């Protein structure tokens, strides 16, 4: 009777994968989005006597960390990072986080925020001279020019905190901001040091890395798997219906 559950599980987890895939495709135009990878893992039931039942469960082993195609928008605050680089922004709960969205905005009082998260430099959050033509160099040096004054000024202000961390060492949080894993936190400390070897380009915005070929193949496979599990469920139900007459003496 329980073979109608095994297949059911697969069907249910199929829907889960579909959700993940949709969550990727809804973010096809999101800047600095890292598509979540999905993977079914098989769990066997341990016990007597004949191990025949093996269920599935979906999981998301992190994200896909191949940098996307760059968007050339003529805005000096827009930045694109070298492969395996992260900007450090203060998250909601007063803690550090890593993001790839390089669309930096200037607040009314001069605070640099990405998506409302105040960016953190070498000395903490950055305070920009209210109203200034910000120019970011190739390594994160910020130069501010005040309107009206001469151009022999372009005095530097600070430097962004760019972090090197591969995709294996980082896990996503529920707010969409990436953080270090527990093992990586133990092995590389809590707060990562800024790597001066990371190159940052100003005037370009990085898009998402949602591959449409993979999404289409995943949808086709999910649909076929769902139909197979529904057929198995129907077969099991019909068999039990036929079998439940024996009890008639």
């Amino acid at each position: 009777d329980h073979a109608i559950y095994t297949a059911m599980g697969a069907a249910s987890q199929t829907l889960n994968q579909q959700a993940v895939t949709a969550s990727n495709l809804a973010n096809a135009s999101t800047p600095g989005f890292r598509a979540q990878l999905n993977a079914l893992r098989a769990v066997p039931v341990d016990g007597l006597s004949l191990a025949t039942r093996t269920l599935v469960t979906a999981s998301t082993p992190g994200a896909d960390m191949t940098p996307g195609q760059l968007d050339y928008t003529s805005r000096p605050l827009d930045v694109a990072l070298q492969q395996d680089g992260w900007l450090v922004v203060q998250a909601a709960d007063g803690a550090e986080g890593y993001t790839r969205n390089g669309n930096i905005q200037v607040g009314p009082t001069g605070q640099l925020t990405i998506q409302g998260h105040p960016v953190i430099g070498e000395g903490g959050p950055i305070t920009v001279p209210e109203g200034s033509e910000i120019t970011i160099a190739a390594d994160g040096t910020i130069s501010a020019l005040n309107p009206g004054d001469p151009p022999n000024t372009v005095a530097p202000v600070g430097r962004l905190k760019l972090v090197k961390a591969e995709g294996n060492e980082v896990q996503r949080s529920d707010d969409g901001l990436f953080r270090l894993t527990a093992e990586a936190q133990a092995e590389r400390g809590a707060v990562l040091a800024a790597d001066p070897s990371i190159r940052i380009m100003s005037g370009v915005l990085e898009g998402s890395n949602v591959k449409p070929v993979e999404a289409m193949t995943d949808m086709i496979a999910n649909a076929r798997r769902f139909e197979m599990q529904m057929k198995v469920i129907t077969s099991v139900d019909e068999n039990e219906g036929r079998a439940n007459q024996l009890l008639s003496m």
Binding site: G9, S12, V43, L55, T57
Partner: peptide, 16 residues
């Protein structure tokens, strides 16, 4: 003390 029957107890979930 048996629990929920059918779907919920036949899905792989982490122990708590």
């Amino acid at each position: 003390p048996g629990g929920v029957p059918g779907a919920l107890s036949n899905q792989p979930a982490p122990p708590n």
